[PDB]
Design a protein around this ligand. Structure first.
Ligand SMILES: [Mg+2]
Ligand SMILES: [Mg+2]
Ligand SMILES: [Mg+2]
Ligand SMILES: [Mg+2]
Ligand SMILES: [Mg+2]
Ligand SMILES: [Mg+2]
Ligand SMILES: [Mg+2]
Ligand SMILES: [Mg+2]
Ligand SMILES: [Mg+2]
Ligand SMILES: [Mg+2]
Ligand SMILES: [Mg+2]
Lengths: 50, 64, 71, 78, 85
RNA sequence: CUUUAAUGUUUGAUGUUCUAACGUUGACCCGUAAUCCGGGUUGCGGACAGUGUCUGGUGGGUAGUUUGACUGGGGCGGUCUCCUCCUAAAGAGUAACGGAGGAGCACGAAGGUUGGCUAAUCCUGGUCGGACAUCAGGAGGUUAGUGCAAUGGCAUAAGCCAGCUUGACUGCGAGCGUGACGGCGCGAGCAGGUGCGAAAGCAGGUCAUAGUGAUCCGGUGGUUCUGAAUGGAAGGGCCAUC
RNA sequence: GUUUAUUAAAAACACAGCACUGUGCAAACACGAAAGUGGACGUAUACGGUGUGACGCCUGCCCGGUGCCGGGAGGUUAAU
RNA sequence: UUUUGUAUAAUGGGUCAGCGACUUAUAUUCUGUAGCAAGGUUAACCGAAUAGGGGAGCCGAAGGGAAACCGAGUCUUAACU
């Protein structure tokens, strides 16, 4: 149980987030993926947050 | 006297047009990162109470 | 809020229908403030709707009878 | 927090660490004693008792040792 | 007479719930599209014409018709197809 | 403005003195022919003590209760949820304190694709170098490997390597399987956007089956859906999540 | 000496004696929403509680644990 | 009577006579029956008081949605084949 829970917050400016887990020890660099944003209906960048 | 409706039941079931009861699917309150979006999407709509459990519901909701 | 069938417009008065006029005919409760006329029954007479919220189905079925809808 | 100079603060720090070490030693003593009690039989149809079991389970906790470097800096001989 | 009774213990005694695997619609049965045919663990049967394979290796009908079983292929494997009947 | 020091000013602390609140189960007087009580002088304490409200601590002194089940009687021991095999009698299911083992995770690659590739083991020759390191060719043919138990599966590899990547998408979903229900699982296809590929195509997590916790209550973000005269708001609801 | 009236009279309880401890008097303590009573018309050679139990010889070591007593520096800490 | 199972040596009853245990308010669903019928029916109350008035109300003919709201449709969704 070392994979803490993180949410990838959309960079489109809306408050939308996917939620996932991450090994905060072996992967200190913040996650960054291009996922779909149903609010704007465009694949945009999601960046890790708390 | 009048029958007291079970108040907790009245907060979770609503009678439909033909007499059936609609309810809200369980398992969608928390611990939602584990669950796949396919599962969570299917639990979002309201469901109809099953045949076996209709009798228990109607007793708890005699006025509706 | 309450519902008004098209069959209650012939049951009200000489032809004017309003919130106050509907209550005096005992179609809606006396503590009802909004009423909607739905397409449920059939209206034969030229009824005028003073202020209400007729649906599109009810509206056409009222003008077909020769009625009028206003606000 | 602390009001004083570095040497007085140092003295206070040694006293604090000594008290913590003594309390940890007492904790080890008590845990060993209660473990000895847990590892006995019931002796009849009498209690044993779940309250003492719960007390021992909550007594078995974790303490943070100081990550003090101290004398291990290894300079290999050339 | 503190000797009459005796006892012991055991280390196993746990199992898992059964998964109800096996063929659901047998050969010659007429099915609708999407109907599960076999619930497998590996690929005991392989997908043939008009049938598909899920992530569990469940074999489902992709069209509506009769189930068929075959042993075609160079490795003598069992295939499940569907004829649009 | 910056530091500083003085008389004032407020306030706060601590201390000493005082008497007037208060105490007096000190003395005397009167009610009164009464060691009760009250009143009056006086002595002594004195803003302490004591009481009221609020509050921290202590509090089996007292009170109300709890203190699981299975069980070849009960206690003791063991177990309690999930996955794999056998028992299980060639569909499913199938018990015992039956026989064996495992799980309470891992992975932004160990996921998606597009290319490519094929093991274990042994024999022969080869510098340190051998029982076994790397090399070459021969047998062999998956006895290998799979992130972790066991079973089933895997060459078109599901196994190994590399480039590009985020489909580990959003809304749904014909139809099924499995449950007493709660629920759980499989799923073509549709719409919107996307990745890889020249394309056909594949991709809604991982070879599959464990890796988990209803509801209530509450937290966070979004959404004028609601908003107890009205406009807001608070609080609710809905969505996502803890 | 006492005791389980009605299955237990005892090695049990008590006891004189001993020790520890509390208590300065409006005493501690107890009964009592309180007033007030007992303690006691007594005053530390007195009263209460606890343990031991005539007498003789004695009563060894441990204050780490739990309790009690003393300390006030520092830390944590309520209502306000 | 209780049981897997009782002549059971399992329970109860000495025997007679008398008494002795599924009721009654309301409320709700279903069935039968009766009356009216897209309508049915009043409660308290007034009343020369089983009549007659009284339609406050209740249920029904419309549902969907958490809701606003829409309405024979509605909700979901950017939209639904
Ligand atoms: Mg979070
Ligand atoms: Mg008690
Ligand atoms: Mg390939
Ligand atoms: Mg698509
Ligand atoms: Mg392309
Ligand atoms: Mg709000
Ligand atoms: Mg001590
Ligand atoms: Mg102290
Ligand atoms: Mg006999
Ligand atoms: Mg008998
Ligand atoms: Mg009837």
């Amino acid at each position: 149980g070392i994979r803490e829970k993180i949410k990838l917050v959309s960079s489109a400016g809306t408050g939308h987030f996917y939620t996932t887990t991450k090994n905060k020890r072996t992967k200190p660099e913040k996650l960054e993926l291009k996922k779909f944003d149903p609010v704007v209906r465009q694949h945009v960048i999601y960046k890790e947050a708390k | 006297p009048k029958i007291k409706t079970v108040r907790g039941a009245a907060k979770r079931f609503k009678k439909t047009g033909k007499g059936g009861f609609k309810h809200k699917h369980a398992n969608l309150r928390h611990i939602l990162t584990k669950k796949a979006t396919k599962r969570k999407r299917h639990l979002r709509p309201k469901a109809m109470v099953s045949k076996g459990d209709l009798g228990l519901v109607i007793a708890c909701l005699p006025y509706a | 809020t309450a519902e008004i069938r098209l069959s209650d417009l012939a049951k009200v008065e000489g032809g004017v229908v309003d919130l106050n006029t509907l209550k005096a005919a005992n179609i809606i409760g006396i503590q009802i403030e909004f009423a909607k006329v739905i397409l449920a029954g059939e209206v034969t007479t030229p009824v005028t709707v003073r202020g209400l919220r007729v649906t599109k189905g009810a509206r056409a079925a009222i003008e077909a009878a020769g009625g009028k809808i206003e606000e | 927090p602390w009001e004083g100079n570095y040497s007085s603060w140092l003295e206070q720090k040694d006293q604090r660490l000594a008290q913590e070490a003594s309390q940890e030693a007492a904790r080890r003593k008590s845990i060993e004693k209660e473990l000895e009690w847990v590892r006995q039989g019931t002796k009849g149809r009498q209690s044993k008792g779940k309250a003492r079991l719960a007390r021992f389970e909550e007594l078995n906790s974790t303490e943070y040792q100081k990550r003090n470097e101290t004398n291990e800096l290894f300079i290999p001989p050339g | 007479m503190a000797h009459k009774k005796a006892g012991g213990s055991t280390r196993n005694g746990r199992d898992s719930e059964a998964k109800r695997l096996g063929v659901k619609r047998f050969g010659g049965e007429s099915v609708l599209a999407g109907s599960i045919i076999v619930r497998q663990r590996g690929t005991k049967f392989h997908a043939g014409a008009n049938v598909g394979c899920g992530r569990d290796h469940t074999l489902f009908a992709k069209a509506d018709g009769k189930v068929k079983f075959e042993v075609k292929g160079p490795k003598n494997r069992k295939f499940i197809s569907i004829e649009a009947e």
